[model samples]
Target: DITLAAWGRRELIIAESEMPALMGLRRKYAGQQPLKGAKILGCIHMTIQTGVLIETLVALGAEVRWSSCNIFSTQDQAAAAIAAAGIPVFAWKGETEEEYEWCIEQTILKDGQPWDANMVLDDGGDLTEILHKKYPQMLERIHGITEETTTGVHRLLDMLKNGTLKVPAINVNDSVTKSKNDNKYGCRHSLNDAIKRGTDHLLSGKQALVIGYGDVGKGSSQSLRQEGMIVKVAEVDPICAMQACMDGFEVVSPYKNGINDGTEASIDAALLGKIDLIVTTTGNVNVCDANMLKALKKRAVVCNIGHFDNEIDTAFMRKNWAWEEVKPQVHKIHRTGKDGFDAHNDDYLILLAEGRLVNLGNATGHPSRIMDGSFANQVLAQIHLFEQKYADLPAAEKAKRLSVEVLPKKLDEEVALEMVKGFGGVVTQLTPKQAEYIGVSVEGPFKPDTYRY
Candidate 1:
């Protein structure tokens, strides 16, 4: 789910087409003002997808302020549409690194600004960072917090561990529905759409190396394999590398700078002959170093499905190469050939989305049908925080319940059912005998673990 700076949202989605429940939502809560007194400060990507969340928050009667977490990851039209609808928008399509931090600062350190917020929603840890370092006094004013991404969760966890964090923050990233659908299927289709929309290239019969065998990486790798492309995966963990190997792709970066010794390696000429594509999900900064790019095969396209733009090592590429777009969003670079070879004969380098997120920048993004359920959970969780005292309950019980991440599997089931109904299909449960034969319960927790979500 996304957070927003605007009180209202842009009509980026044909909301009725993708999410008919939105109409019902409007009718149910349109006139009510439950959140009338709440002011929310949000920092998330400025996208059409985010517009929905912002509008939903507006429906609940929140005064919100919004900004982008990443410099290059905003959709200006979406931002404008939300602003024109009368939210106090404070960001643009792309922000400078300085602006990224400052926009969030402006949203928070209000100095009596009308939208001085008491709650915080963040995509990355940027907002929280600013608050802790610059606006420490505001911590008590904060009712609670919500983090929408893995990176943000990691930072919050560190804060929690160190006792530096005071507010009750929801770890929205680790939700079962979100991790599987948004991080996996959502990421897969987004990358596929990004590649196609940016270059309109056929996926068949190409070789692409994938980095980081995490959820997003696996998602992109899975889709690429399905499209008949030969794929190789890289990772920084042995277990993850083993997973990649079991998935039938060559593993790279399993142990940091790790590469397959055979011709399938991502860094060599013999390996380069068959190379056609390069993709990575190493969200950690500098996963692909300057040296790594120099060794990439000629005409091999580099792209990041990872969250951070730092994954692609943009600084080095910008310094030595004179580049042009071979196609919109697909950059062609002339390498200097530091080995003193003919520069014209040099293997040209290619990068997609300019070392930024390949999926959101280049693609139409994850299908809204999938996002509808994800956002539904976001709405439910935030509403819970608002209702629950952030837990609307005693501190002891609130702590217990929040730990469970309690979005009932039943609601997720209903969400799936709705998607099914949208497609004109019906789902049937197995009979008692059928369930027994399948060794599954007819009731709940169809999977084994309590954390199965």
Candidate 2:
């Protein structure tokens, strides 16, 4: 409905006010018309925040086409507003995989060739991959590409390593501002929000198992502990496992051929039957498997916060257990009881988001205030590349540039400062004497890269 679009417009307006840095960039650069002739094709999630980003580019004098990166991730209202704003947008929440690919084609191409989109902004690698496969020759016309997901960055870097990359790409996903703030800090809060929302269960006096110890997982662990739940970590990497140990978490090895063993014989053995909450953050398939299900206590809440759906054994559960969807995006799976005549001894697992990402699917994702630093980094990176390629350069010269990159070290600090200010938080300034003692500048990047997030 246009009413929903209208509602979305008000929300975006509020978001624009909240995202001061991006809006400020729009104001600072729109007057200069820095992107006056740029034709930007964007393959990203179509959300209210992304709507702000698209309009920001248009405000900066660029022509834009947009599509949703995921088939089911679009907010139709947001997409509608972008269309009403007259930007060519191809997206809807119920799109199929084929429609997803079609939207990318519609966004980046016209009849038989490229549509003069000089820059690419992608959250996933779909746009970049299609451009290379279907329009390799058109790649020469692309000025730059920016990617902001771990998977997308990995694919782009693989292309660079394989000599298949045709354009310089910025890996914004790896920027410390993004990795630390958007991931660690964002998840630190959202993990609790999502878990509590999904389970409607208290964390205090419950045992929560976080299945990985990466930045996001570490944050989840901390969040669970903060909720007064005893936390255990299941990790494959020795160093990460050791870090879990040093951080005062019980580390368990819970996989046999990728099946989580929660049976009486193994797997954080002492705490097996007492476990109340289990979350998969391993980004690996079946961290919670059918075999492990046997050891779980009755009515345990098992869900995933991993990047992909296969992180939990949803397929096996569908194949093995009886699934009854009692509510939207919530279900109860019973391994033993289906017959009404017989009473079962225990209740089965409670699944949220159909074993998909609980944070985005079942709960509203990270708050806007937390995303200030991350999206600011995106806006700045885009501007930097547009300015970098304002004038044409030779292929050899462009080739000499780093094909895959993160944001510069100095700008990383600036983004932090901008975020703290945008977030209305205070930072303690270093005195010269204190700086001398620390052997760092008074105006400082106080922490080293090796510091745990």
Candidate 3:
């Protein structure tokens, strides 16, 4: 009673100060019991910030169980803290795939609501995916889910398209507070911290290429440039490509940009040996393939900051090349390939964190300050679903609704206001004329879905 759990409780005490917004929500709603008798199941990264969220749900009159979404992402201290409090948490750091499945299943099976979870909160769709796969009958009990990641949103959309989706879901990933700020700012601070710590090199003067120019990519390229590294970006999205170009970085698209070879290969061969570091922010698989591996100069570091590890071809390097551990989480992989068609030779490549999320695996993840907004969005989203019973709605409202949608703009605005309070800043009220011109309520539902933030 005075060991791991005690230490865990100490951690919660420390984390609670960092997560003022969630604690404030608990203060505002705990006495009201708005979520009275609600049963919730969750699978998210089991970090201290998430732990605060779990406790907030309990404070709001909900009974909850949880698991970690990623195999390597759970913080043992956080999970142990909940364990110390005698809560049913099914996660820890470095679990196997089998253990991962068991953890999620336990949250659903052990809910004590008799396998009936009224609300689901997911980070990567793992809980919702597993529940639908193994227990389609339980779909009858699922009121809705709040998915907070791009990967999960895409998966739920697929389920909708295929007619396999069974319940309403909230798309919490694209809210302006999250997509515009939390992700970009979180990655900006973290990528530099992780890369510098893992490689033990100054970022200045390094030629860096950030693949995939999404918000994460934009933030990463900015981070590299801020440290005086020459930043180049590669993106398949046209809007992102233009944004990258406008942001004063070279767009490294093979055929879209001006850097194409104009003959045999579509890749920019001139900088083949000049890139010093490669970071993938794309969620797609095989972005860093064998051919690209052979082209980079020796000792050039490679790592992925993407959400998924499959973005970089670590498997290809392991299967086809001889690899040596230069140090923990850093490796030198030797492979043979051509340099400009005539020279077929060996190249030694330095890999960081085994091409996993270098920011998370190599260094501690985003600082708690930025995660304050992210986890705040998570709690507010769940509270929104608890107040709005999508399952109990009439047939007409259900017919007009899609399988997935973002939290109401009004709810998003409330989260924004809550986040500002953590900084102890006062918000200025908008004048009536200004609100009318902006076509928004003075209290806000401010930005429309298509309005670019």
Candidate 4:
């Protein structure tokens, strides 16, 4: 195990070179130890990039317990290294559902005793949900939570709406630094690489369908088009669909009058048959349902870049069709005619990562430079909450803590500035006259929340 962990340490050394923001945080705060008494429970992909984040948390004096957010997203060597360093990390590659829950439980309970965590860094909302469901008392102890992905933010907002969310949560995913850098540019860098690694198929001139036109979908479509594929998008949001069209993508909707009745209409079935590859970025369930699966072109590769694995309905595929593992996370599903009709005779479709997030499940996720901007926000959010003294807060401040919140815009600009500096780029400062003309401070928080880059 030490040998494996040693190799992972070497990999982390390489990653640290590219992750300047987190490293800078380590240097800046190691002396202060703002999180000296904090206990952080993190559930995210256990990879080299995340390894850097975990170590940074430790360097800043936060005791952390980590588990993989997805069953298939852990890099075993990285987990080994974290564990070897005496941090409690409960994760490995390819865990079953029961094992996945068990790993999460380990972070909460150690050797039959409660490991009371005061802070949470969650990717999806599973860790947060389990804390509320299985240990309601923990809610009162948690100072704050930082959610990493879009799906988790949605879940937290839903919890807030239903009067269920008890702890303060920061929507780290919505920070401009995180969403613009990680979701848009990060997906652009990783999606095509994941496809190539999983399918080994040439993308040039292929007819590709990208479902969803949000930030992730924007990057996915751009990556496909850059690879010489003829790309089209299916989106529900009118503004996003319009953005897709302006970006030179043919936008199509499968639902009748754009109203989803839980299945695409037959009129749009022809579009599915012509697609060489379909990548779902919708972050919604059943984006690629049975009807669309049945109409897929032979040998077409289908995968998801969304946060959750249910985007492509792989459960239906597993229950209805027979599949064989062609590679580690690649499967070829043969249509078994179980429904008693051969729409496409001898049809087989290639699925990557069992409909999970292809970039993490099939290949390593975003490069360290991109994640540096995102995880810097995570570290800053942690520090923000740690300083708030949640237990001693006034009644009004305590009530505000129960709702999801965003980092101050100044912090976002700080993240961007650090990243630019890290990459050997310098930013121009606004003159006092220019600041007066714009009616803003010279030290900047330059743009409004609505400003789009």
The most accurate candidate by TM-score is 4
The Cα error of candidate 2 at residue 134, in Å, is 3.2
lDDT of 2 by residue, 20-105 (tens): 66656655666677676678776765667667677777766667766665544566766777788876666665446686666556
- Residue-by-residue lDDT tens digits, candidate 3, 1-453: 236767777766776666666667777776677777788876666666667767666656667666665655656655777766557666655556787666555655543555657777776665565677776778776776777767777887788889878777767667777788877898889888887787778878878777888878777777888899997787767877888777788866534254544344555556767888877787887665455655567778777776777876667666766655556677556665322222444456677766445666766677776777677777677667666666467788767765445666776677677778878999899998997787777885665678987
Cα lDDT, all candidates: 0.66, 0.70, 0.70, 0.74
The TM-score that candidate 2 achieves is: 0.84
Give TM per candidate: 0.80, 0.84, 0.85, 0.91
- What candidate 3 gets wrong by more than 4 Å, as runs, is 1-5, 88-114, 254-269, 323-327, 336-347, 390-405, 430-441, 445-449
Q: What digit string (tens of lDDT, one per residue) describes model 1 on residues 161-207?
A: 89767867766555566787778888767777778777778989877
Question: Which of the two candidates, 2 or 4, achieves a greater lDDT against the reference?
Answer: 4
Tell how far residue 97 is off in model 3, in angstroms.
3.9
TM-score of 4: 0.91
Q: How far is candidate 1 from the true structure (C-alpha RMSD, Å)?
A: 5.5
For this target, which candidate reaches the highest lDDT against the unseen true structure?
4
Off by over 4 Å in 4: 255-265, 337-346, 394-405
* Per-candidate count of clashing residue pairs (backbone under 3 Å): 9, 0, 0, 0
Query: What does the lDDT come to for candidate 2?
Result: 0.70
Model 2 residue runs over 4 Å out of place are 88-113, 255-272, 285-290, 322-324, 336-346, 394-406, 423-453
Model 1 misplaced stretches (Cα beyond 4 Å): 1-13, 20-33, 94-96, 99-104, 109-115, 252-269, 318-330, 337-346, 390-417, 425-453
Better of 1 and 3 by lDDT: 3
